[PDB]
Design a binder for this molecule. Structure first.
Ligand SMILES: [Cl-]
Ligand code: NA
Length: 239
């Protein structure tokens, strides 16, 4: 049962000092498709809960610092909800699908989101020295505090890992959207083809198979998008 009261107090300050700020970028849907919107809703929830749990972690480190100081004198959190996602694609017609896909920021906010959460991952996990054991504080109280610090340390690294996973979900949805724009017939081309059909009556039997292929392309894209955009909630552990 050795003590150094100076160390206890210094470590109290070190432990509750501000950690990296989590980003507050709001990820917006890349386009007007339901599957895109539901992805954004899921990210909003996951990221709100991450920030709420990170605020609870700051409380925990304050509470450790208070506990360290009260020693030296002597000498509501829930799961991230899952957003409902459509079981079946729902094939709207060509033009409306193309309009929905082409209306919105096309993934720009998702890149910014990912970038913020990625930086927070990388930086937060290099601020764990604050949870090391003591040099000259020994006994049961010291051992208890060391356990508690090590629990916070492990929780921080887990939070950093979940931050990386969430940023990747956002990148994944941005990639998906880019893929969907590359593959889906453009609004302008659908209108062009409808125009070609209207204006060329004798060509209409040659145009019909082309239009049917535009429809198969669209459906194929909407089926992928509906399926691949459904995200898992990010569910952090309690500190
Ligand atoms: Cl839709
Ligand atoms: Na295609």
């Amino acid at each position: 049962v050795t003590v150094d009261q100076q160390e206890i107090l210094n470590r109290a300050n070190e432990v509750e000092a501000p950690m990296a700020d989590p980003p507050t970028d709001v990820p917006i849907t890349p386009c007007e498709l339901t599957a895109a919107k539901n992805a954004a809703q899921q990210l909003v929830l996951s990221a709100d809960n991450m920030r709420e749990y990170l605020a609870a972690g700051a409380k925990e480190r304050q509470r450790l610092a208070t506990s360290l100081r009260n020693a030296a004198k002597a000498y509501e959190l829930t799961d991230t909800p899952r957003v409902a996602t459509a079981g079946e694609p729902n094939f709207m017609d060509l033009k409306e699908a193309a309009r929905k896909l082409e209306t919105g920021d096309q993934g720009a906010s998702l890149a910014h989101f990912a970038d913020g959460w990625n930086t927070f991952n990388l930086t937060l996990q290099g601020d764990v020295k604050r949870f090391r054991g003591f040099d000259n504080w020994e006994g049961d109280a010291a051992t208890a505090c060391e356990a508690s610090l090590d629990q916070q340390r492990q929780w921080i690294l887990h939070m950093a890992k979940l931050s990386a996973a969430m940023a990747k979900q956002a990148q994944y949805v941005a990639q998906l959207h880019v893929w969907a724009r590359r593959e889906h017939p453009t609004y302008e081309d659908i209108v062009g083809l409808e125009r070609l059909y209207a204006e060329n009556p004798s060509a209409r039997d040659q145009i019909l198979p082309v239009y049917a292929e535009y429809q198969q392309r669209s459906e194929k894209v909407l089926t992928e998008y509906n399926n691949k955009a459904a995200l898992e909630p990010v569910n952090p552990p309690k500190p």
